[PDB]
Amino acid sequence: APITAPDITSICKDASSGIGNQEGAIRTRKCCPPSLGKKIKDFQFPNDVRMRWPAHKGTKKQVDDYRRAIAAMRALPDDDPRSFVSQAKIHCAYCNGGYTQVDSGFPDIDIQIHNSWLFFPFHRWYLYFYERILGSLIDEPNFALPYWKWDEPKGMPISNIFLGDASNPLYDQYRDANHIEDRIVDLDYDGKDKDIPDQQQVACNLSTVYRDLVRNGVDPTSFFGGKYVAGDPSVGSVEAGSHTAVHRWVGDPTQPNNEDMGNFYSAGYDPVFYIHHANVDRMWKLWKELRLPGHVDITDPDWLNASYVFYDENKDLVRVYNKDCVNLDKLKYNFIENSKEVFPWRNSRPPQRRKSAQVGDVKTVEQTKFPVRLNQIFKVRVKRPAVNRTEEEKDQANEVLLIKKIKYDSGKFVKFDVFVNDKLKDGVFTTPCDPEYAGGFAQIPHNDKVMTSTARFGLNELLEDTNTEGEEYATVTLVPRTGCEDLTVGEIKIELVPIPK
Ligand SMILES: [Cu+2]
Ligand SMILES: [Cu+2]
């Protein structure tokens, strides 16, 4: 029973999900696509590779092509599926409950590609057509999108090509003014700017990438997201991590729903949105090229046969499947990489905690009455499935912390941090990217006419970094950051997950 997008031209409705303040909304909620009376045809692969370039190291030609392309797209009539507005509505229609699972036999259930394993493949198809449309608008058959390389220090700030004023096609007034001044991106943003040096921000941005691709991105479930079929799946490490941070970091916090980037329904109206996801799409490639155990593609038929519908460069309706976007070579595009051998985030594992900087009585899961609400710092000891595991055992299965049944009002942005075994003496110098930090759970608004979620955290490296591989219990600390005044956690447990081959 795979998720199947219906006739987006026939069955569609106004966006009513993920919008806290529907009144005084800067962008439209009528995200339905144009009706050209088109028949949905099956997808077919292209022929001869599009090289996507770093937005911060683009040449005059590369930048001019992109600017001229967006300008051409902005020039098209709104009724055109290939227009700037129509393309932005695509994200709104799929992320803010524009369609339903009517094709699966459930017209009362909305389709939501986010917070599931449909996250990566959908946005890949989204960019694929969005990329080919722009290329056709400027008569560039080998046109390629840039990508925001925020995993590299010099590429972390927003590229100046997007800055300027309305004369620039890549400009968007609806961005955070405090963040467009050549300032470094915060890949662990929680709604409030941190008072740290630029050196520290870059160092911890690299750590965030390492945390999302290695520490937490241990298996297909933890990386892509939870299983989602027709009829509260886990959110991926990338999706609920660096990805969400950038959206809230760029979005203008003065606007009602943090438009444009700060919300799904309006994100498409900012040109940087597609360039951000261009690098999120690249995380998928890097995640595999690491060639670490567990870093494999999805093989579940329920995922492979899942499909969406898009307008292509020829205004034709095309149905694409997830099974046909695992190989970039077949889609005929890739990313221009640096000559340097390794990636600066490749070894950005948090430093080992000194025992001399560490020092007790905390309730366990049995002694605690669930569900608990995260209106303050919450601590609890969780029984581990094993202790003193050998290098062979830790290389065969991941010890994963599971925070399940996360209930909360998804009318606004929510985030809380997760610390494990934080027994630091009270005179120690702390940093954002400390070893105790397991990561966080962040969610862009996606409410429906209180949402429930689940998080996953790897402990293989963390327990070693905190000198607690021999301890029977692990002290888990949940720290609310924003929108947790009503958040509720239903279950907490640690389990050994075998690494798939
Ligand atoms: Cu999206
Ligand atoms: Cu996004």
Side-chain angles (χ1 to χ4, degrees), residues 1-7 9 12-22 24-38 40 43 45-46 49-59 61-63 65-75 77-78 80-131 133-137 140-180 183-194 196-220 222-231 233 235-290 292-319 321-322 324-331 333-337 339 342-382 384-390 393 397-403 405-425 427-448 451-470 472-484 486-490 492 494 496-498 500:
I3 300 293
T4 306
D7 182 24
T9 291
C12 174
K13 53 179 170 175
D14 302 341
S16 303
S17 296
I19 307 170
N21 187 19
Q22 296 187 8
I26 265 74
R27 306 297 183 177
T28 181
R29 295 190 300 95
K30 295 182 174 61
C31 303
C32 292
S35 306
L36 280 54
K38 301 270 173 178
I40 302 175
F43 174 75
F45 291 101
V49 175
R50 293 174 150 87
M51 295 302 230
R52 295 181 177 177
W53 44 281
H56 70 295
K57 290 187 293 186
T59 62
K61 188 187 189 302
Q62 286 173 327
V63 175
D65 286 21
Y66 177 51
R67 282 184 176 177
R68 182 158 45 91
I70 295 295
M73 175 171 286
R74 285 184 181 276
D78 297 26
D80 193 316
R82 301 139 62 254
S83 70
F84 190 86
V85 179
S86 291
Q87 286 297 312
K89 282 172 172 175
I90 299 171
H91 195 250
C92 178
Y94 278 100
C95 300
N96 303 85
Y99 310 114
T100 67
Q101 301 178 10
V102 59
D103 281 26
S104 300
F106 300 94
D108 296 329
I109 305 177
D110 293 333
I111 297 174
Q112 178 60 284
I113 62 94
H114 294 100
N115 56 87
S116 71
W117 60 2
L118 301 177
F119 173 76
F120 275 102
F122 168 85
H123 287 93
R124 172 161 290 188
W125 283 117
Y126 189 8
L127 287 174
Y128 172 79
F129 293 107
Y130 176 85
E131 181 173 43
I133 289 165
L134 288 172
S136 67
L137 289 177
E140 281 291 351
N142 200 36
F143 175 83
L145 289 168
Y147 69 91
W148 190 358
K149 194 171 185 179
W150 38 249
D151 64 276
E152 182 174 338
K154 290 175 66 177
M156 282 171 185
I158 300 173
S159 184
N160 60 325
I161 64 175
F162 300 100
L163 309 180
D165 57 33
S167 72
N168 181 14
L170 311 184
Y171 173 86
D172 195 331
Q173 57 176 313
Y174 301 111
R175 296 169 176 161
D176 196 327
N178 300 125
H179 295 172
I180 56 172
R183 276 176 60 176
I184 303 171
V185 64
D186 193 344
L187 299 178
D188 197 37
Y189 191 62
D190 53 15
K192 186 168 66 61
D193 299 322
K194 316 186 207 182
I196 57 172
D198 295 23
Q199 171 62 14
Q200 189 67 73
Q201 185 65 70
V202 176
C204 285
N205 281 340
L206 295 171
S207 295
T208 301
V209 175
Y210 182 92
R211 180 169 58 260
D212 289 24
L213 264 56
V214 185
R215 270 191 158 196
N216 292 328
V218 298
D219 51 24
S222 303
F223 183 75
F224 295 105
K227 177 159 183 174
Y228 176 64
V229 296
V235 63
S237 57
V238 179
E239 182 176 3
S242 55
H243 167 254
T244 295
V246 174
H247 274 274
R248 302 295 299 184
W249 191 80
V250 177
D252 184 19
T254 67
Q255 299 301 320
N257 302 283
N258 296 263
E259 293 87 336
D260 285 322
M261 280 279 284
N263 196 288
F264 291 148
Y265 102 106
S266 57
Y269 292 89
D270 196 328
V272 79
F273 165 76
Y274 304 99
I275 309 313
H276 168 55
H277 277 264
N279 195 31
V280 176
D281 185 35
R282 173 168 165 268
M283 292 298 109
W284 187 357
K285 191 196 73 169
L286 298 178
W287 182 73
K288 293 178 61 52
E289 286 186 353
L290 284 167
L292 293 171
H295 292 207
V296 298
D297 280 320
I298 301 172
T299 60
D300 196 330
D302 295 323
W303 180 84
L304 293 167
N305 295 326
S307 61
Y308 327 94
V309 181
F310 298 93
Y311 276 104
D312 59 9
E313 56 274 13
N314 301 324
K315 301 186 179 184
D316 299 327
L317 285 173
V318 185
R319 181 175 295 281
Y321 296 78
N322 295 345
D324 298 328
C325 82
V326 297
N327 193 339
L328 296 175
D329 303 331
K330 293 192 177 185
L331 297 180
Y333 77 92
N334 209 276
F335 308 90
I336 312 184
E337 300 286 1
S339 57
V342 67
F343 292 109
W345 53 260
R346 182 63 188 84
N347 300 117
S348 292
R349 177 176 173 180
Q352 178 70 41
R353 180 64 66 186
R354 296 184 181 82
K355 301 184 187 180
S356 64
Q358 296 181 329
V359 298
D361 52 333
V362 181
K363 288 182 296 300
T364 65
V365 180
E366 299 86 24
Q367 304 173 45
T368 306
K369 178 178 69 61
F370 287 79
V372 297
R373 62 180 297 182
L374 195 62
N375 55 18
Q376 62 177 349
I377 299 175
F378 172 75
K379 298 200 296 183
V380 62
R381 289 187 298 164
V382 187
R384 294 177 55 197
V387 299
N388 297 122
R389 292 199 303 158
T390 61
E393 286 176 316
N398 288 113
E399 196 167 350
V400 183
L401 173 60
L402 303 180
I403 304 176
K405 291 188 290 178
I406 303 171
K407 308 176 84 69
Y408 62 95
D409 172 34
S410 186
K412 294 296 181 308
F413 173 67
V414 184
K415 180 175 182 180
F416 64 85
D417 288 334
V418 185
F419 300 94
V420 179
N421 298 330
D422 184 19
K423 48 165 157 170
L424 300 182
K425 296 185 180 186
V428 176
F429 173 75
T430 58
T431 74
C433 45
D434 273 333
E436 292 77 9
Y437 187 54
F441 171 83
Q443 276 292 333
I444 298 168
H446 66 198
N447 211 326
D448 179 273
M451 292 298 97
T452 309
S453 305
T454 302
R456 302 170 62 90
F457 304 93
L459 304 179
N460 277 23
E461 294 187 1
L462 193 150
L463 295 170
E464 179 185 354
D465 294 340
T466 58
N467 307 315
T468 53
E469 286 188 318
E472 183 183 355
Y473 285 89
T475 309
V476 180
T477 302
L478 306 183
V479 183
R481 299 302 188 187
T482 173
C484 294
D486 65 282
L487 183 137
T488 297
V489 181
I492 306 175
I494 301 172
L496 293 172
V497 185

